[PDB]
Each structure stands twice: as structure tokens, then as C-alpha cells.
Design an enzyme around this catalytic site. Structure first.
Site, PDB file in Angstrom:
ATOM      1  CG  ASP A 154      -2.326  -0.564   0.990  1.00  0.00           C
ATOM      2  OD1 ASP A 154      -2.544  -1.312   0.015  1.00  0.00           O
ATOM      3  OD2 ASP A 154      -3.230  -0.280   1.829  1.00  0.00           O
ATOM      4  CB  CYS A 197      -1.245   1.135 -11.389  1.00  0.00           C
ATOM      5  SG  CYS A 197      -0.427   2.638 -12.164  1.00  0.00           S
ATOM      6  NE  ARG A 221       1.280   0.464  -6.848  1.00  0.00           N
ATOM      7  CZ  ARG A 221       0.313   0.095  -6.012  1.00  0.00           C
ATOM      8  NH1 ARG A 221      -0.551  -0.853  -6.368  1.00  0.00           N
ATOM      9  NH2 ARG A 221       0.202   0.705  -4.828  1.00  0.00           N
ATOM     10  CB  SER A 222       1.422   1.768 -15.443  1.00  0.00           C
ATOM     11  OG  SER A 222       0.170   1.227 -14.999  1.00  0.00           O
ATOM     12  CD  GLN A 248       2.134   8.009  -9.435  1.00  0.00           C
ATOM     13  OE1 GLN A 248       2.002   6.817  -9.151  1.00  0.00           O
ATOM     14  NE2 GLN A 248       1.186   8.887  -9.223  1.00  0.00           N
TER      15      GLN A 248
END
Ligand SMILES: CC1CCN(c2ccc(N)cc2Cl)CC1
Length: 282
Positions: free
Chosen positions: A181, A215, A221-222, A262
Site C-alpha cells: 500500500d 494501476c 507502477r505502470s 511518480q
């Protein structure tokens, strides 16, 4: 510089945030006018994450062709990807329309439906064989065919039917279920094993349309997934693998979708994944 020793040099000097801010400063800026039209407000999950006009995927529909999705075309590596946000309640039909129209074989999902106690994406596929889904706005039917649950990821076989023509296709759903998370994984080993399972399925190969990867926003994440895949392919193709520059590859991918990677932690994790993955390839 090479990668593994540039890596140790950034660790010892604790300068990941400065490296990452340089990337943010140099990244391309292109217009996203269609994404910001008022009629498309409820088609965007986040107001600060939009596809560029020049690379956006267009739905084959004369009313409104907009979806928050981008085509990332990597010329030297000979690999294409569609990066998209997690579907919203009102865009699940658009999502599967895109899969159909672009001739994709595989869908890669890097988030859970609920994270940090909030919904990160709609439940856009069926969870039981006998309870299929019909998307009336786009005239598609979707059926769960099989499901294989493993410790770090789940693979599903899905059947997508175009109800207008009665044509059917098999879609493979690759669901990475263990990204934490907060932060990034401690080791890249399970993420790389997942990347190799997608590769081994045929989903990334030129005989199909581009793989769809998502994502929640479709950039973090992508971005890590396609950056690691492309860098490892280049290290296999070139005479000199130490010439692959992960920062230059990331800036190339950011010509096609904003915001890829990110955080500075995600940047460091991408280096780690490429470094470890290059050893296993040989
Ligand atoms: C779609 C839901 C499905 C359940 N997911 C999940 C979470 C933790 C583990 N370990 C495994 C899985 Cl399959 C979260 C999202």
C-alpha cells in the site's frame, strides 16, 4: 555511466531525489486539450493525470472518442504498450471497447481494487464463471474462463465477445496482487518473475495489438513495468549492453505519457529491477 555503479554512487551520495527532480524538469510538455473538455470530466480519475493529444487512444465512436489512455511506441526496442488509468464505474465499457478495437491479447493490472481503505479502480471483470458481464453501452460480453491464484499474482483467462458480430477472442489477465500500500517492494524478484510470466504468454509480441497496462493513475507502477521491460530488451539487442541509459529511456517514454515514475523510490526500484534482471537473462 554504467547502471550498477551509477546506482551505488547515487546510494552512497543519497541523491535520488535530485536525480528524479532533474527528470521531472527535462520531461516533455505537450497539449492534452481533449482530456480537459468539460464533457470528459467524469472520464478522468485524477485532474492532474491526462493523456497527450498526439498519443491518446481514440475509441471508434463518433459521439465521444475519449478514454484516458496513451500509446507508448518504443522504436529501437520494437515494443508498444497502452498505459491507462484504472477503469471508473462509467468507463468499464470504454475500457473493453479499447481492448477489442486495438486487438490486445493481454491486460496487466498492478493494483488491488481497494487500497488504503479507498477504491482504486472498478471491479471490471467477472469473479465467477457462471456470472458473466454485459456492457450495454459498447455491446460487449465478458466471461471468466479460468483463474489461477499464486502467491504474488493471479492469471485469468477471459472470453470477450463482440455482440454485434458474434466474434470472440481470448484475453489473458495478469494481476500483480502484492505491491505494498505504501512505498515499493523490498526485492524486485517477484515483480521480475511476474514480468517474465507476461512475456512467456505471447501477450507482448508483435503478432498482437499492444498490451494494456494499468494501476490506479496509469503512470507510477505502470511506468515501472514498461521501463523495466524495454531496458532489458535493449540490453539483449545491443552489442554493448552497458550503453543502455535508463534515464534516457524514461525521458523517451515520457514523450508519450506524462508523469511516468511518480517518486524517487520508484526510480530506484526500476534501477534495481533492471540490474537484477540482467543477470538472470544470461
Ligand atoms: C481484486 C482484489 C482481489 C484480491 N486481491 C489480493 C490481495 C492479497 C493477496 N495476497 C492476494 C490477492 Cl489475490 C486484492 C484485489
Amino acid at each position: 555511466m554504467e547502471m550498477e555503479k551509477e546506482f551505488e554512487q547515487i546510494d552512497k551520495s543519497g541523491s535520488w531525489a535530485a536525480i528524479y527532480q532533474d527528470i521531472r524538469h527535462e520531461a516533455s510538455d505537450f497539449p492534452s486539450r481533449v482530456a480537459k473538455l468539460p464533457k470528459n470530466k467524469n472520464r478522468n480519475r485524477y485532474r492532474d493525470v491526462s493523456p497527450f493529444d498526439h498519443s491518446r487512444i481514440k475509441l471508434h465512436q463518433e459521439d465521444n472518442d475519449y478514454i484516458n489512455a496513451s500509446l507508448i511506441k518504443m522504436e529501437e526496442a520494437q515494443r508498444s504498450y497502452i498505459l491507462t488509468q484504472g477503469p471508473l464505474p462509467n468507463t468499464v465499457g470504454h475500457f473493453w471497447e479499447m481492448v477489442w478495437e486495438q486487438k490486445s491479447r493481454g491486460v496487466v493490472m498492478l493494483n488491488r481494487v481497494m487500497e488504503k481503505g479507498s477504491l482504486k479502480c472498478a471491479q471490471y471483470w467477472p469473479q465467477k464463471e457462471e456470472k458473466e458481464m454485459i456492457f450495454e453501452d459498447t455491446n460487449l460480453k465478458l466471461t471468466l474462463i479460468s483463474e489461477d491464484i499464486k502467491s504474488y499474482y493471479t492469471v485469468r483467462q477471459l472470453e470477450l465477445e463482440n455482440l454485434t458480430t458474434q466474434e470472440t477472442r481470448e484475453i489473458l489477465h495478469f494481476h500483480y496482487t502484492t505491491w505494498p500500500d505504501f512505498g515499493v517492494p523490498e526485492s524486485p524478484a517477484s515483480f521480475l518473475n511476474f514480468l517474465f510470466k507476461v512475456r512467456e504468454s505471447g501477450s507482448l509480441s508483435p503478432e498482437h495489438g499492444p498490451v494494456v497496462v494499468h494501476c490506479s493513475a496509469g503512470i507510477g507502477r505502470s511506468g515501472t513495468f514498461c521501463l523495466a521491460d524495454t531496458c532489458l530488451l535493449l540490453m539483449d539487442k545491443r552489442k554493448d549492453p552497458s550503453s543502455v541509459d535508463i534515464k534516457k529511456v524514461l525521458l523517451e517514454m515520457r514523450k508519450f505519457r506524462m508523469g511516468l515514475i511518480q517518486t524517487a523510490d520508484q526510480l530506484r526500484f526500476s534501477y534495481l529491477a533492471v540490474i537484477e534482471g540482467a543477470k538472470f537473462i544470461m
